[PDB]
Amino acid sequence: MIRAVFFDSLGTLISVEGAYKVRLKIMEEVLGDYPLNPATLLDEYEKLAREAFSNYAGKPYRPMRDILEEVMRKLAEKYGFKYPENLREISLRMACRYGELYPEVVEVLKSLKGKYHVGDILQRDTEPATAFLDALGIKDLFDSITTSEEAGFFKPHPRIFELALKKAGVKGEKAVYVGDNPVKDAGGSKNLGMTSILLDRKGEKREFWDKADFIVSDLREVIKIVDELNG
Numbered sequence: 001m002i003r004a005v006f007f008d009s010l011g012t013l014i015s016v017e018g019a020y021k022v023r024l025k026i027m028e029e030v031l032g033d034y035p036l037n038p039a040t041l042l043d044e045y046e047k048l049a050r051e052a053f054s055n056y057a058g059k060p061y062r063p064m065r066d067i068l069e070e071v072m073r074k075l076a077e078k079y080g081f082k083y084p085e086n087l088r089e090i091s092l093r094m095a096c097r098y099g100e101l102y103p104e105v106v107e108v109l110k111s112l113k114g115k116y117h118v119g120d121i122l123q124r125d126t127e128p129a130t131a132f133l134d135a136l137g138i139k140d141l142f143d144s145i146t147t148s149e150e151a152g153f154f155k156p157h158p159r160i161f162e163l164a165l166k167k168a169g170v171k172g173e174k175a176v177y178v179g180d181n182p183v184k185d186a187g188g189s190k191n192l193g194m195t196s197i198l199l200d201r202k203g204e205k206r207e208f209w210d211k212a213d214f215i216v217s218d219l220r221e222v223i224k225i226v227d228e229l230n231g
């Protein structure tokens with residue numbers, strides 16, 4: 001039977017408008033009156049971030065805040081603005097202020113928490129990630145929160161999933177993983193026997209549906225999938 005349901009909250013439960021706005025507001029704060037369009041800085045930042053993290057996939061963990069500060073140092077050098085001090089404080093304040101959940105998230109976590117181990121699996125430094133979940137109001141709705149910093153390796157390394165399963169006290173065949181990227185999950189979670197649910201809210205990942213056991217566009221579908229897997 002299914003006894004655990006794992007999510008990737010900061011990645012499958014944060015609205016796209018909210019996440020973009022958090023990041024835009026960070027760039028606006030970094031730049032102040034410097035004459036660079038914050039949306040261009042954000043685009044360039046995202047590119048470099050993705051690159052830098054690509055170099056780390058599967059590798060031993062390194063604080064992501066350190067990685068993102070190195071990226072921002074390159075952007076400051078590129079565009080000529082002064083490197084912002086206390087970038088991680090700016091980022092945490094903006095996340096807590098403008099972060100926003102998809103509308104059905106709280107209901108789905110509450111409905112599941114009574115009958116399953118409800119877990120979060122996050123590739124984020126544990127301290128800011130947990131503060132963000134606290135600010136979003138959902139930290140205590142999870143039975144467990146597991147991070148790459150705790151596991152010691154970046155996805156798709158499976159250690160993060162192994163640790164999340166240990167916290168739930170079950171082997172992977174008893175668990176579902178809800179994610180939005182079947183790359184970091186299939187190379188890690190499918191090896192452990194977990195059932196993968198791909199969240200594709202706008203039907204834009206059809207070329208990756210084959211790497212998922214189920215596809216949903218609304219998180220309320222997850223409850224039905226698991227209740228039936230158990231019926």
Ligand SMILES: [Cl-]
Pocket residue numbers: 064065124125128
């Ligand atoms: Cl982080």
